[PDB]
Enzyme design. Structure first.
Site, PDB file in Angstrom:
ATOM      1  N   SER A  43      -1.122   0.463   4.232  1.00 39.33           N
ATOM      2  CA  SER A  43      -2.070   0.700   3.131  1.00 39.33           C
ATOM      3  C   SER A  43      -2.581   2.371   3.523  1.00 39.33           C
ATOM      4  O   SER A  43      -3.499   2.876   2.940  1.00 39.33           O
ATOM      5  CB  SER A  43      -3.288   0.096   3.294  1.00 39.33           C
ATOM      6  OG  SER A  43      -2.757  -1.239   2.466  1.00 39.33           O
ATOM      7  N   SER A 103      -8.835  -1.834   0.458  1.00 41.20           N
ATOM      8  CA  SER A 103      -7.443  -1.744   0.607  1.00 41.20           C
ATOM      9  C   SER A 103      -6.985  -2.567  -0.535  1.00 41.20           C
ATOM     10  O   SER A 103      -6.090  -3.306  -0.237  1.00 41.20           O
ATOM     11  CB  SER A 103      -7.084  -2.250   1.937  1.00 41.20           C
ATOM     12  OG  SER A 103      -6.071  -1.492   2.340  1.00 41.20           O
ATOM     13  N   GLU A 139       3.113  -2.033  -3.922  1.00 40.51           N
ATOM     14  CA  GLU A 139       2.474  -3.017  -3.264  1.00 40.51           C
ATOM     15  C   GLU A 139       3.108  -4.234  -3.724  1.00 40.51           C
ATOM     16  O   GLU A 139       3.238  -4.743  -5.036  1.00 40.51           O
ATOM     17  CB  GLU A 139       1.027  -2.945  -3.333  1.00 40.51           C
ATOM     18  CG  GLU A 139       0.497  -1.724  -2.748  1.00 40.51           C
ATOM     19  CD  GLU A 139       0.250  -2.078  -1.223  1.00 40.51           C
ATOM     20  OE1 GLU A 139       0.911  -2.839  -0.694  1.00 40.51           O
ATOM     21  OE2 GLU A 139      -0.153  -1.012  -0.684  1.00 40.51           O
TER      22      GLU A 139
END
Length: 261
Positions: A43, A103, A139
């Site tokens: 991240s 995040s 992601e």
């Protein structure tokens, strides 16, 4: 130096692989430990995506207020903020804040989409002189952190230089730089990482990262009271795929660095 011997000992005690880069902006001196080895960013890559959108907003003045729909199909594995806005919208500013301060992985994927894919994030890195950063995936798969895999990696040296340019330098416009700094200072995920190894009186803006192989990262800008700021990148990864996170290693590395300045 003393500091490199202490960082090597910390690494040996940890069982993993530690990468550190410190820039002291007082004299532009650098302290590096495995500074040119690649590490999975996890991240910490969200800083580059947010900054790339900020760069776009220098020309598209209203861009950060653009609403972006959050659909159920957009949700991935960790979406603390986006979850609160499913079937609604979030602005690009709100998504940037969520990606950085919580995040949020859905937020990151929306930023990547805004930039035209991972290649758009990488292109921004190249445009500001970072030839090392590479974002290859979205992601959550960019966190696989497989040993030896160059995807979604950078080096400590490169990331420290880039973070300096984005926050203390002029890679971004003045309003954008200030916004990024504000976002980083408001991070909520960093209390046990670099911050925990530093005097409580110092102001820190940071972005953590975590991934498989016990990958535990943090990148920070540090404003000591009565002293030029520092940029500190700490990357850590381990040999076992299912290893647990080791934020304490990052705290310890910060403490070792802080001893001596």
């Amino acid at each position: 130096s003393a500091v490199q011997q202490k960082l090597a000992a910390l690494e040996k005690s940890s069982g993993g692989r530690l990468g550190v880069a410190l820039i002291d902006t007082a004299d532009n001196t650098q302290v590096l430990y495995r500074g040119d080895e690649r590490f999975p960013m996890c991240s910490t890559s969200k800083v580059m995506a947010a900054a790339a959108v900020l760069k776009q907003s220098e020309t598209q003045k209203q861009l950060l207020n653009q609403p972006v729909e959050i659909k159920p199909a957009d949700l991935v594995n960790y979406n603390p903020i986006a979850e609160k806005h499913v079937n609604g919208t979030m602005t690009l500013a709100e998504l940037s804040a969520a990606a950085l301060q919580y995040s949020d992985n859905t937020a990151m994927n929306k930023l990547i989409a805004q930039l035209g894919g991972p290649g758009g994030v990488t292109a921004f890195a190249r445009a500001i002189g970072d030839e090392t950063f590479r974002l290859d995936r979205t992601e959550p798969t960019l966190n696989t952190a497989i040993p030896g895999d160059p995807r979604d990696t950078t080096t400590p040296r490169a990331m420290a230089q880039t973070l300096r340019q984005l926050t203390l330098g002029h890679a971004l416009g003045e309003t954008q730089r200030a916004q990024l700094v504000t976002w980083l200072k408001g991070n909520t995920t960093g209390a046990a990482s670099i911050r925990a190894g530093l005097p409580t009186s110092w102001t820190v803006g940071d972005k953590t990262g975590s991934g498989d192989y016990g990958t535990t990262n943090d990148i920070a800008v540090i404003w000591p009271q009565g002293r030029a700021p520092l940029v500190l990148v700490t990357y850590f990864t381990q040999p076992q795929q299912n290893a647990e996170s080791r934020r304490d290693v990052l705290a310890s590395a910060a403490r070792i660095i802080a001893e001596g300045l």
